[PDB]
Ligand binder design. Structure first.
Ligand SMILES: [Mg+2]
Length: 281
């Protein structure tokens, strides 16, 4: 079991070493589309590049590229799209992807400002009465409502295809308390946030994949998906104890790089899966 394993690593002080084995085992696929000169302005510096095979394609004729990847977890029956925090010039693209992929939810695991530096564009409206128009992709976006809680905020947004006048309700799940340095001391609030995203229907099969992002190059998104999938598999399988977080991570890692960026994030993932499992089971 996983708690046993966790403890073997904790007292043995081998987090760094176990983390490094996984990293060497991990997949390495081409990212040629991402490295094309015409796409240089579509990529966030110090951020991951999407593998070609799993990249999400915008449905426009001009340039179909966005830094986003589809993680498809076959056994768990979950899909997630992981993407970079929108850039000043890719907000239209971002919401285009949300529209076309039929996503219900967007999961944001960073603040707009962290460490005194901008981590993404203000890509959603902060006020009901001041909507946003993305002229490049023909979308309007409106803040419908906003509910600020201690560890996270949930917003309802409406997206309008300006040409056809169709509308879609999107839920924005904004985790606002991940510390600037390290990981949360207790996974409790993060698990609670995951349960709120679940409760919304945003991870469920009736919708397209949730869109998940964080800040550039420092993970978090992978932890959210890893924890979600592991907990789901523990409920599905005849043998819950066969769920190996390393194996689930390695499978996820086939679809996008930089899922777990440090030994501490790995430790935190174990910790979230264990306490999440105790709470559900
Ligand atoms: Mg394929």
């Amino acid at each position: 079991e996983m708690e046993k394993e966790f403890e073997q690593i904790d007292k043995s002080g081998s987090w760094a070493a176990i983390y490094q084995d996984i990293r060497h085992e991990a997949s390495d696929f081409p990212c040629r589309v991402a490295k094309l000169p015409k796409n240089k302005n579509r990529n966030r510096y110090r951020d991951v590049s999407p593998f070609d095979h799993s990249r999400i394609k915008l449905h426009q004729e001009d340039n179909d590229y966005i830094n986003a990847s589809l993680i498809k977890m076959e056994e768990a029956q979950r899909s997630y799209i992981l993407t970079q925090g929108p850039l000043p010039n890719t907000c239209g693209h971002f919401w285009e992807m949300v529209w076309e992929q039929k996503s219900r939810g967007v999961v944001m695991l960073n603040r707009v400002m962290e460490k005194g530096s901008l981590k993404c564009a203000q890509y959603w409206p902060q006020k009901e009465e001041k909507e946003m128009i993305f002229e490049d992709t023909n979308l309007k976006l409106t803040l419908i409502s906003e509910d600020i809680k201690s560890y996270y905020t949930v917003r309802q947004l409406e997206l309008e295809n300006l040409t056809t006048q169709e509308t879609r309700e999107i839920l924005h799940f904004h985790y606002t308390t991940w510390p600037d340095f390290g990981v949360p001391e207790s996974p409790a609030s993060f698990l609670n946030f995951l349960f709120k995203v679940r409760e919304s229907g945003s991870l469920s099969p009736e919708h397209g994949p949730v869109v998940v992002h964080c800040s550039a190059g420092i993970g978090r998104s992978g932890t959210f998906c890893l924890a979600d999938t592991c907990l789901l598999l523990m409920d599905k399988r005849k043998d819950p104890s066969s769920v190996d977080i390393k194996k689930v991570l390695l499978e996820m890692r086939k679809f996008r790089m930089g899922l777990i960026q440090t030994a501490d994030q790995l430790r935190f993932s174990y910790l979230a899966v264990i306490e999440g499992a105790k709470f559900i089971m």
